[PDB]
Amino acid sequence: SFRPKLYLAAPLFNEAEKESNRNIRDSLIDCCDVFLPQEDGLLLDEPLKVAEKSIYEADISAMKNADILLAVLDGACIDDGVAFELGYAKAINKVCLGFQTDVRRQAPTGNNPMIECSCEEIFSDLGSLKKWLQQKY
Amino acid sequence: SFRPKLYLAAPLFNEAEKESNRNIRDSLIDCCDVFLPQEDLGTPLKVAEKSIYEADISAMKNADILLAVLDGACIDDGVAFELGYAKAINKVCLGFQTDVRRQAPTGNNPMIECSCEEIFSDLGSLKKWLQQKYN
Amino acid sequence: SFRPKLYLAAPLFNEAEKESNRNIRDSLIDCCDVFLPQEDTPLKVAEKSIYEADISAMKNADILLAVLDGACIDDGVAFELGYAKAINKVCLGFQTDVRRQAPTGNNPMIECSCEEIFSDLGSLKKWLQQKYN
Amino acid sequence: RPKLYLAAPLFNEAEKESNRNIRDSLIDCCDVFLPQEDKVAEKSIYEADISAMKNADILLAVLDGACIDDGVAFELGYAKAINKVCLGFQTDVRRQAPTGNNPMIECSCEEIFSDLGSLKKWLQQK
Numbered sequence: 001s002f003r004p005k006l007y008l009a010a011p012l013f014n015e016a017e018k019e020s021n022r023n024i025r026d027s028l029i030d031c032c033d034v035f036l037p038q039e040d041g042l043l044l045d046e047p048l049k050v051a052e053k054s055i056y057e058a059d060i061s062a063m064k065n066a067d068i069l070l071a072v073l074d075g076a077c078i079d080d081g082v083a084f085e086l087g088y089a090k091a092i093n094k095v096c097l098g099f100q101t102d103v104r105r106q107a108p109t110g111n112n113p114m115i116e117c118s119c120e121e122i123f124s125d126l127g128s129l130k131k132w133l134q135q136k137y
Numbered sequence: 138s139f140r141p142k143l144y145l146a147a148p149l150f151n152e153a154e155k156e157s158n159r160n161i162r163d164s165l166i167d168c169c170d171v172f173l174p175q176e177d178l179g180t181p182l183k184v185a186e187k188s189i190y191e192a193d194i195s196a197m198k199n200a201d202i203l204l205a206v207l208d209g210a211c212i213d214d215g216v217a218f219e220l221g222y223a224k225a226i227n228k229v230c231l232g233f234q235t236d237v238r239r240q241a242p243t244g245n246n247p248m249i250e251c252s253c254e255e256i257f258s259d260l261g262s263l264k265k266w267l268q269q270k271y272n
Numbered sequence: 273s274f275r276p277k278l279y280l281a282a283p284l285f286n287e288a289e290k291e292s293n294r295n296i297r298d299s300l301i302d303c304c305d306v307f308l309p310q311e312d313t314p315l316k317v318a319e320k321s322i323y324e325a326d327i328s329a330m331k332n333a334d335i336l337l338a339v340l341d342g343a344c345i346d347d348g349v350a351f352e353l354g355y356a357k358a359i360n361k362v363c364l365g366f367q368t369d370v371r372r373q374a375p376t377g378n379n380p381m382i383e384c385s386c387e388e389i390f391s392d393l394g395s396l397k398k399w400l401q402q403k404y405n
Numbered sequence: 406r407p408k409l410y411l412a413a414p415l416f417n418e419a420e421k422e423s424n425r426n427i428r429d430s431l432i433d434c435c436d437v438f439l440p441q442e443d444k445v446a447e448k449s450i451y452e453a454d455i456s457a458m459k460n461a462d463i464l465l466a467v468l469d470g471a472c473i474d475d476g477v478a479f480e481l482g483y484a485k486a487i488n489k490v491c492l493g494f495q496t497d498v499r500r501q502a503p504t505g506n507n508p509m510i511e512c513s514c515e516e517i518f519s520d521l522g523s524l525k526k527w528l529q530q531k
Contacts, residue, residue, distance in 0.1 A: 011343070013241070013341075013369050013370050013371050014341045014368045014369040014370070015368055016288045016289065016291075016292040016341070016368075017288070019288070020288040044241075044243060044247065044370075045241075045243070045370050048243065048244075051247075052244075052247040052250055052251055053247075053251055055247045056247045056248060056251035056252070059248065074285075074286050074288070075342065075343045076211075076283070076285075076342045076343040076344040076346065076472055077210075077211035077214065077343045077344065077471050077472065078211075078214035079214075079246075079343060080211065080212035080214065080216075080217040080240070080245075080246050080248070080249055081217075081246040081247075081248045081249070082214075083214040083215075083216075083217035083218045083221070084217045084218065084220055084221035084224075084246075084248040084249060084252065085221060085248060086218055086221065087217070087218035087219060087220065087221030087222035087223075087225070088221035088222065088224060088225040089221075089225075090218075090222060091221070091222040091223075091225035091226050092225050101286045101287055101288075102285050102286045103285050103286070103502050104285050104501055104502050105500070105502060105503045106214070106499060107150070107498055107499050107500060107503075108500055108503040108504070108505075109182065109503070110182075110503065111214075112213075112214050112215045112218070113185075113186040113187075113189045113190045113193075113215070114190060114193065114214070114215045114218040114219065115214055115215075115218065116186055116190075117186050117187055117190035118190075118218065148471070150469075150471075150497050150498050150499050151469045151496045151497040151498070151499075152423075152496050153419045153420065153422075153423040153469070153496075154419065156419075157419045208417045208419070209417075209470070209471050210344055210414070210470045210471040210472040210474065211343055211344065211471040211472065213471065235417040235418055235419075236416050236417045237374055237416050237417070238373055238374050238416050239372075239374065239375050240371055241370050241371045241372060241375075242372050242374075242375040242376070242377070243375075244375070285502075315504060315505075318508075319508040319511050319512050320508075320512050322508045323508050323509060323511075323512035323513070326508075326509065343472075344471075344472035344475065345475035346507075347472065347473035347474075347475065347478040347501065347506075347507050347509070347510055348478075348507040348508070348509040348510070349475075350473075350475040350476075350477075350478035350479045350482065351478045351479070351481055351482035351485075351507070351509040351510060351513065352482060352509060353479055353482065354478070354479035354480060354481065354482030354483035354484075354486070355482035355483065355485060355486045356482075356486075357483060358482070358483040358484075358486035358487050359486050373475070374416075378475075379474075379475050379476040379479070380447035380448075380450045380451050380476075381451065381454065381475070381476045381479040381480065382475055382476070382479060383447055383451075384447055384448050384450075384451035385451070385479060
């Protein structure tokens with residue numbers, strides 16, 4: 001089969017966000033290995049600058065290990081952790097994709113140019129994401 | 138060595154932000170060559186975004202220093218992208234922040250907080266700090 | 273004395289937000305009767321219609337429940353909170369987000385504007401019964 | 406000489422300087438209350454902003470920002486409810502949705518102004 005490695009970059013600050021990341025992960029598991037930052041032992045609010053540093057390095061690793069970075073763009077604004085991770089993964093030449101069901105945008109003209117142009121594709125639904133993934137490989 | 142290469146990652150969406158960024162540039166233009174995205178119709182959207190994007194990537198590759206202005210209701214997603222991109226290609230990443238606001242009561246998101254070598258709250262200290270690093 | 277009328281002021285911009293609102297409403301439908309704005313032609317006329325619909329629905333409400341979660345507190349939620357407080361409804365917040373405005377918590381207009389802010393649907397419904405009897 | 410309440414974010418010195426640019430701009434037409442100039446610490450902050458909002462004729466809410474500020478929006482709503490003339494000032498090219506501002510904001514503001522020259526001129530008629 002070959003199971004590509006996927007890193008889900010996504011806000012994880014309330015249970016709706018965390019339940020929604022699980023949904024995306026369960027939808028991809030028959031395709032791809034999925035790293036989920038919220039399930040990777042280290043979560044902040046549960047040692048301040050050492051927890052921060054531990055979270056940071058664990059995320060950098062997981063990004064380096066992945067083939068794909070899926071960035072969840074939903075929210076009143078695009079989360080800054082997600083944007084940073086999107087730019088880092090682009091610069092080390094990962095395949096970069098966006099997931100966006102939200103009606104809100106940065107400006108009437110859509111997402112920021114650095115988000116819109118770094119994602120090869122931005123998807124509004126999981127099925128299109130899954131078919132696009134299978135044709136890419 | 139020459140004058141160091143500062144790229145200014147900053148929100149530029151109203152006239153306050155644009156003036157704020159000109160103020161930052163004018164104070165550094167003794168230390169560093171400064172790239173301001175806002176200064177450096179009949180345009181189809183997709184090729185517009187591409188050219189703005191490509192030029193910023195190219196400027197970022199050509200910088201020694203990325204300075205990320207972290208102020209605002211949210212940290213700008215353009216700024217946060219540029220920080221991650223610059224950090225992955227091993228630039229010097231600094232933050233500038235004057236807002237009282239944060240993501241959570243624990244501070245900035247750890248990716249922003251741990252990727253900036255330092256975050257400054259006043260230009261004088263930032264400028265002097267760069268001066269010590271490069272003599 | 274019948275069932276109290278409750279207005280759910282919440283962001284409704286994606287299916288996760290819309291589902292989460294439905295879950296708040298379902299949890300409360302034994303206590304109270306819940307107006308759900310997501311459950312209730314040019315755009316200049318569509319705005320004032322939603323506006324008037326919502327305004328009228330807050331005026332006929334007893335309780336305003338404002339969910340504060342998000343990268344920012346939604347501006348509509350914030351508008352509805354202040355509009356409901358000025359006409360003397362009971363104003364309550366619901367907040368599961370670990371995020372705040374400052375490292376000192378919510379904006380004080382929000383913090384003192386709400387009479388209490390809950391993190392469980394459990395504790396909130398208990399407060400209301402022990403309030404009304 | 407109406408009394409005017411500036412609903413404005415005030416969390417960095419760019420925002421605060423920008424506020425005083427608005428208020429100094431209009432101090433020939435109207436009196437302006439600036440919240441940045443004028444447990445229990447938050448309660449006092451609360452009690453004073455509402456009583457100042459009460460004494461105002463006009464609420465002008467600056468909408469610029471990556472979000473419309475919740476404090477500003479709270480006061481916009483409060484001010485509309487007790488029947489002030491509510492207006493907006495928006496220079497930011499950002500919007501909530503690609504269809505403009507939230508309908509609670511757009512329709513509670515009688516007019517949304519792009520520059521102070523227009524705002525200045527509109528209050529001449531009122």
